[PDB]
Each structure stands twice: as C-alpha cells, then as structure tokens.
C-alpha cells in the first residue's frame, strides 16, 4: 500500500502526498500485474493434461519399480518420496503476501497424473485420446526412436530395468 | 469453416497491449496537472504572480517532478518492450518451423500431431491455423513382444502384433489395418526361450507355396 | 492492527447487480447472512458448497467463485475430469479413425513507436 | 511438453544421451525433471569400409 507506506497513519503527510498525482496507482497497478502473472506461470507448467489419471492397483511395469515417485498414500499432502525430500531442503507497514491459487496439494496431484499418464499410455495421452500399451513395449517403441533395433531390449530386460532401478 | 464462426461470433493479447500503451500515455498527459508542492500547475501563473527570484524555486518543483514522471515512462516502456521482443523472437521460429516444414515437437505447432499450419496477419501480430491429425475411435486387442515359430523368435518391422480373440495380425501403431505375419513383414533374432512374453503362432513364407 | 484489501466479485453487470466481498487475510470475526473463511481470507456474500466444478473467477488457495443460474458461491476448484486407463500385461488400444483439428494462435509482434 | 508428453531428439534438451523418457516432481516454487537416457559403452574398434 503505497500510502501506508509513505505517510503511515499520519494526515499531514496524505494530503501532502496527495500533491504528486498518480504515482501511487501506477506502482499498485505494477504489483498487481506480476501477481497475476505468477498463477498464470505455474497454470502453464502443471495443468498440461485433461484428466486425472491414475495407475491401477497393481504394480506389473516389467520389473521396472516406480515406487519412489508414485504418491505416498499415507499422508495428507499425497507427495512422493521425491516430492517429500525435496520439501524439506527448501504483518508490516503496508506490505502483504497474497497466496497462490492452487495449493501444492493440487499441484502434486496434476504431477501424479502426468506421471501415470507416461507410465500407462507412453505418448499418446499428450496428442489425443490416452491409449494403454504394456511398458515393456513403450519401451522397445523408444529403444527404435534412438535408432537401436528393439530385440536389445527385449533380450536384456531384467538388466536394463535392474540399471533404471539402481539409478533411481 | 468453424474458425470463421468463432471469430466472426477471442484477440485478447493483441487487445492488452494497446491498452497498455494508451493507458500508459494518459497517465503521462494527466501528470501535467500537477503542482508537487508549488502554487499551481500553469507556468504562466507562476510567471504572473511571483518576481523572478521567487519563481525560480516555483518552477525547479515543477521540472523536478515532471522530469521523475517522464524518466518512469520511458522505464516502464524499455521493460514492456522486452516482452514484445520475446514474442516476436517465438512467433519468428514458429513461422520457420510449423508453416515452411513440418514441426516433430510436441505441442509447438497445436495439439496432435502437426500436418500443416498458415499464417494471417492481425493489427499487431500474427494468427496461424495450425491442421493436426488426431486419432478417434479406439479398440483394444491384446499384444505380444514376438512370435516363437519353428524355434526362432520373429518381430514387427515396422508394427504391432495384435490379435482379433482367436488370430494373430501386424498392424501399424496409429490406424487399425491388420496384415497376415509374413517372413516379409518380420524378422527374426534368437531362440524363443529368452523373450518374455512370446505366443506361438506360424509365420507364413511366401515363396514356399508359390514356388511349390 | 488488522488491515487488507478488500476485493468485489461480480457475475458483471449485464448479468446481475449482486456482489460479494473479500476481506483479504483478515479474520471473519472482526470484518465489520453467509460469512465464509477462506486461506485468502473472509468472503461475504456468497455461499459455500460441497460440489466442484471447473474455475470461474479465481479467489485463491483452490477457491472459486461462480454465478451459475442464482446467486455467488464458493468452492474448490476442479483440476479436471477422471480418466481411468485399463493397463494390463498385454493389452493394447489402437485407432480405428481419425479428426482433422484446426486451431488458432495469435500473437503479438509489435507496439506503437512513440516519441516525445 | 516434450520431454514428459513426448521422446526428443534435440541434443542436449532432455539430458546427456539419447533421450529415452523424463519424469516430472513438484518442488517449492518450482519443478524438477528426472531425465532417463540411453549412454553407449564398451566400444571396440574395428576395420571399415
Ligand atoms: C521398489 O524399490 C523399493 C526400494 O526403494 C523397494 O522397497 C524396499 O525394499 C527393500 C527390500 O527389497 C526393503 O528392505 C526396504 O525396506 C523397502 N523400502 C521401502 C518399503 O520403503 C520396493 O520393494 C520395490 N518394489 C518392488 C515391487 O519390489
Ligand atoms: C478396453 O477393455 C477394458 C477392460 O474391460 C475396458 O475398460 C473397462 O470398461 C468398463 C466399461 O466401460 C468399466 O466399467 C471398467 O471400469 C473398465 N476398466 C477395467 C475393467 O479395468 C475398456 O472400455 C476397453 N476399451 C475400449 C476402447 O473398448
Ligand atoms: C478374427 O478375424 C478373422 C479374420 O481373418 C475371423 O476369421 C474369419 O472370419 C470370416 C467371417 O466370420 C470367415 O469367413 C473366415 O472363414 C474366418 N477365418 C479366416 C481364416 O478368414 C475371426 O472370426 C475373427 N475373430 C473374432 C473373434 O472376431
Ligand atoms: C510353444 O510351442 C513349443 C513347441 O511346439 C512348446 O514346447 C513344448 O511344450 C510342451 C508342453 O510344455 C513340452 O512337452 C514339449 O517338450 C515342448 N517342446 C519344445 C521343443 O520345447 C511350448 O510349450 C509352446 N508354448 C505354449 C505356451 O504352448
Ligand atoms: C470415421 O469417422 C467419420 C466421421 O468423422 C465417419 O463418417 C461419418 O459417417 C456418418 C455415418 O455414416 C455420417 O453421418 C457422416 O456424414 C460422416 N462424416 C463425414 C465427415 O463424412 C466414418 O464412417 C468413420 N469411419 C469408420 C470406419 O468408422
Ligand atoms: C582402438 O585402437 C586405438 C589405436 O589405433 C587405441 O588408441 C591407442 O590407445 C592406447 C591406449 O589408450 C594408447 O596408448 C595409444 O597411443 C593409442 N594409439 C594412438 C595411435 O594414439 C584405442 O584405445 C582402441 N580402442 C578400443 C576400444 O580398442
Ligand atoms: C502377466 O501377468 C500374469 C498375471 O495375471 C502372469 O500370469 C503372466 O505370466 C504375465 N505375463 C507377462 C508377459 O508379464
Ligand atoms: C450482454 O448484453 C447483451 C444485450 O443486453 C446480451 O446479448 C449478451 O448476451 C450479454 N452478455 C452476457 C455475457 O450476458
Ligand atoms: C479468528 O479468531 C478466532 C478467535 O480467536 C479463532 O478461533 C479463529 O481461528 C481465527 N481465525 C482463523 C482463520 O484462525
Ligand atoms: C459437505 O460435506 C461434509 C462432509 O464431511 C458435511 O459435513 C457438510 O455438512 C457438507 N456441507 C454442506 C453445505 O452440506
């Protein structure tokens, strides 16, 4: 509040400071526009997906285990062990912080959806309609797009889900 | 035929910039009228009512102020200006990429996969119509990774191999055409023992009848 | 000393004459019916109810408010529909058809060149 | 976009190699990407022609 800031309850600085114009609204019309555009950031990074996806009970990925980055039913917030370890390494005269539009409860949640969409149906759901295939062979369908001949992985599977595992 | 309704029945982007210009030049003009603590805001009022001596420390509030007010201005233009730049910079690279090839990144040039884009020109900007296929209308079947036949282990050249319930087809990935598995349409690396997953079905050699 | 913006919320006047009123991070209790506390602070005037739809007007902290039909309400936003995918070991979806889609992009390439 | 929704093949953009998939985390006031790629080894060399 520029006026609060300036003067500050007094009444001989706001009708001295009422001398200077609108120096006063162009500064809270500055603030307000990066305001805005702060929820239309995060609106563009996480909402990128039509439904809310979700991985179904059981867990057959072809010995691939995405257990660390799946959400933790066991808690309020619903976050990830990624998500967990990465949230615990991060009134005045006039001033106010305003909060965001989504909670980061619902930003997990576009997050999660994101990922089951990948681990479910590949690309697909990113260009149409979410179309299921088995990993093992959205896996091979990205072996081929790197220029690799997909019978290596299909005769190293257990090596090359062990390597994903260890990296993980 | 639908875009012509939609618009003729949507430029907000193009609308706010000229907002902003105009209401960035009235707050200028508006300021004119301001005294920042001196008798008036006319020059001819202070060159009237005051000796020179005097109208000296009148007029150096008026220029202090009025300059402040210009200098901010011209800030806040240097700062919008950038933003302009920036769109000019990506609509420049979609021109080059979605209207003279055909662009492979995803969501660049609309949502699907891109076929073609054209462009129109607006006041200040630019439209594309951005034409992508997007498939419809799905079935599922069940797959395998291979096919085990006389010992050997066979995949799809360029498919998927699916079955109906009770017969084994290849298709390609993306539309529904189902084609006999034949030695032309697979090949064959290894013994069926290591892949996971393999059926057993025939694959059909075509010179061994025709020839026979 | 408590003090806060204070924000209108209104359908727009070619709909309706009816407004509510944010309090921003102001408690309920010392404003000064439907008198609702919200993590952006208290809102008067509209009603809270238990269904979500998509977002209309933006309150904050996952609420929105919406003049359907008749008069303002609160809520929860809706980040989107349900989509549950039938993944198996062995089961794969393929098209049997296609749309051609055409969508626009406007953007903005130049301002007015101004000099003083 | 295109290295969550989709495989890239421009160098560099989705991490050292060749791109096989990235997963996506929220984290305070930001995300990360977990980028899963393809690295060759254990080359031997050979003639040509
Ligand atoms: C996925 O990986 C996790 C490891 O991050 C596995 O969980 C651990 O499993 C070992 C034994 O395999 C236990 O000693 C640990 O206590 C487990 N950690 C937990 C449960 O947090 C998990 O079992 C793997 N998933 C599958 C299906 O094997
Ligand atoms: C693919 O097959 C699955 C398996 O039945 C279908 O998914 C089920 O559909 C029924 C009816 O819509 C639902 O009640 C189930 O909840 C779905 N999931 C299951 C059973 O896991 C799906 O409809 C089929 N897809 C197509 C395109 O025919
Ligand atoms: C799977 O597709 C095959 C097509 O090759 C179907 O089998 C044929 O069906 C037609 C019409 O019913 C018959 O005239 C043929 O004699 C069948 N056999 C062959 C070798 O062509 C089969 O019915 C389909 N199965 C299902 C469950 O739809
Ligand atoms: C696929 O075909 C092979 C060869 O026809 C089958 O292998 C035979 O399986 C039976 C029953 O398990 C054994 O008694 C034979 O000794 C096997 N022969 C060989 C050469 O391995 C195989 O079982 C078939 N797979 C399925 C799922 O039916
Ligand atoms: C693929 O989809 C198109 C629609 O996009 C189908 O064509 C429509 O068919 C209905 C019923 O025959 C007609 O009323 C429409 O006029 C057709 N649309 C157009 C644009 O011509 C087509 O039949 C579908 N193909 C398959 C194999 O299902
Ligand atoms: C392939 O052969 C080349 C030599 O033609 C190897 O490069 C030699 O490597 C040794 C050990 O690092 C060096 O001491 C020599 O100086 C290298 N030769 C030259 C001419 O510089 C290379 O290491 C071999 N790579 C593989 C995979 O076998
Ligand atoms: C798929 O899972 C079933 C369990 O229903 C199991 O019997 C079968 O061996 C699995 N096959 C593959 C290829 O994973
Ligand atoms: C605005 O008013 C006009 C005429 O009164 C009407 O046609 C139009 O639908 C109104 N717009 C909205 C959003 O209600
Ligand atoms: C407002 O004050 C009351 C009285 O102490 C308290 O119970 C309530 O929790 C306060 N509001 C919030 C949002 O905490
Ligand atoms: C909304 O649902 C909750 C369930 O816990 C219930 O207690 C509450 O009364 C409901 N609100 C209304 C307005 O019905």
Redesign the pocket.
Known sequence: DCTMYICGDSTECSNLLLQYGSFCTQLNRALTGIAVEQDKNTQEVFAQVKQIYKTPPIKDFGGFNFSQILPDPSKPSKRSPIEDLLFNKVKFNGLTVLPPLLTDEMIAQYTSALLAGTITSGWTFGAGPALQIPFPMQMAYRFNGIGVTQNVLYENQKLIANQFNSAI | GKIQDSLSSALGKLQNVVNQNAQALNTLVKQLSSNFGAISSVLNDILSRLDPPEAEVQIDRLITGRLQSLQTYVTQQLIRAAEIRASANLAATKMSECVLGQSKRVDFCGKGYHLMSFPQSAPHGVVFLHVTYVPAQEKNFTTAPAICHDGKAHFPREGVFVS????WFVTQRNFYEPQIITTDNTFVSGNCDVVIGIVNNTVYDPLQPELD | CSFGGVSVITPGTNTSNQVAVLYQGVNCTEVPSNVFQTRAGCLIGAEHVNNSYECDIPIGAGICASYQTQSIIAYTMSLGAENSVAYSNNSIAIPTNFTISVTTEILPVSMTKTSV
């Open positions: 109906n319930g009770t017969h």
